[PDB]
């Protein structure tokens, strides 16, 4: 059973958005579709449910006129009059005792700021040791979601990816990878940065 959602969504305040939840691996028309909201500072709030076989729905008071569920085999949650407080991760889930399944969650960023692609810069040391640490600096992008992979993700054992920070009005994060000294620079390592929001995929070869 899989419940797939959209990874992210950027919307301006005052607008309204529809988030989908495509159910698979079971009889949609059985389990009630739930929606939960989680904001960075961990704490989950329940929103509501809808019966795929009826379209009967149950909402939490606080989201009475905020959310509006519908189904079809997908399930939708539409929000309204978005504010900064609405910036959160929204999950769709089937919560029935032992039948518990959650979707990946859709990150909803409510902001006027425009999408900006990241500038990737390589961090090569300016040597020494039995192993050398390399890195990439992803600078000045928006919205948040960026993914850094090394050697297309095949080099994954000694990677440290550091959380994004607001620098100016844009985000900034870095990633590091530690490889054996004898393998660099004889073999090249490349960091790949993917910014879905800007349809960006940049590779950077790490040369001395």
């Amino acid at each position: 059973v899989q419940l797939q959602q959209s990874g992210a969504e950027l919307v301006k305040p005052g607008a309204s958005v529809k988030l989908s939840c495509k159910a698979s691996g079971y009889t949609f028309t059985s389990y009630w579709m739930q929606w939960v909201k989680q904001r960075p500072g961990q704490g989950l709030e329940w929103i509501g449910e809808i019966d795929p076989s009826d379209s009967y729905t149950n909402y939490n008071q606080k989201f009475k006129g905020k959310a509006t569920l519908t189904v079809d085999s997908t399930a939708y949650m539409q929000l309204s009059s978005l504010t900064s407080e609405d910036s959160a991760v929204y999950y769709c889930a089937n919560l029935r005792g032992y039948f518990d399944y959650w979707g990946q969650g859709t990150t909803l960023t409510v902001s006027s700021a425009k999408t900006t692609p990241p500038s990737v810069y390589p961090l090569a040391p300016g040597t020494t040791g039995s192993s050398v640490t390399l890195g990439c600096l992803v600078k000045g992008y928006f919205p948040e979601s960026v993914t850094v992979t090394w050697n297309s993700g095949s080099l994954s054992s000694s990677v440290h990816t550091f959380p994004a920070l607001l620098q100016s009005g844009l985000y900034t994060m870095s990633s590091s990878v530690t490889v054996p000294s004898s393998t660099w620079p004889s073999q090249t390592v490349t960091c790949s940065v993917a910014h879905p929001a800007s349809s960006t995929t940049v590779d950077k070869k790490l040369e001395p």
Partner: protein, 216 residues
Amino acid sequence: DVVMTQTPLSLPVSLGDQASISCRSSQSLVHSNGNTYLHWYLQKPGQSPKLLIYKVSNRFSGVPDRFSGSGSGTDFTLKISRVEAEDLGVYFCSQSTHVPRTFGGGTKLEIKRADAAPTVSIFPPSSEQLTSGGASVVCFLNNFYPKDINVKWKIDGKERQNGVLNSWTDQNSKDSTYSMSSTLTLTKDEYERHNSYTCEATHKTSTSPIVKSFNR
């Protein structure tokens, strides 16, 4: 609505030991139908929550017997008999006896491991960035423990307070250590007026600060 409370909010435990996370409800979770719908979820960073124990003590599919849930009425306890490195994350207790379904705040499991000095690496700004007129000099302080560390930037011996950003990763599930990056951003002009850039960290496994610098 019904408020769930978790004790403690953070819990440091050694690998191999037992852990006990408490959850308390504002109201009794005993439904008129006789069941007590109290559940436990484990949330790993960047992941949706995953159910561990539903209805107080029943294990979800594939969950090990290390995990046991207990309690009654308003008092509930989640226990892990053999804390394992990849058990870290946030444990939430949820309840669905009363509408609306509600969750606790979460208890963060932190592993207590042996001291480890951080490995420091400092990187000069790349030609490509220097070209754009900016200059971020980076410092990685990897795999240390405990998480308490102090980073200091020095330019030709003078300490730099402004223009520095620090980010630390959460405890690593593989080796229970922490990491951090400190970045000093300058203009290509400021950077070119000076010679040596120093990244200095003080950690309890040192006594004498760890220093890493490159002269330009």
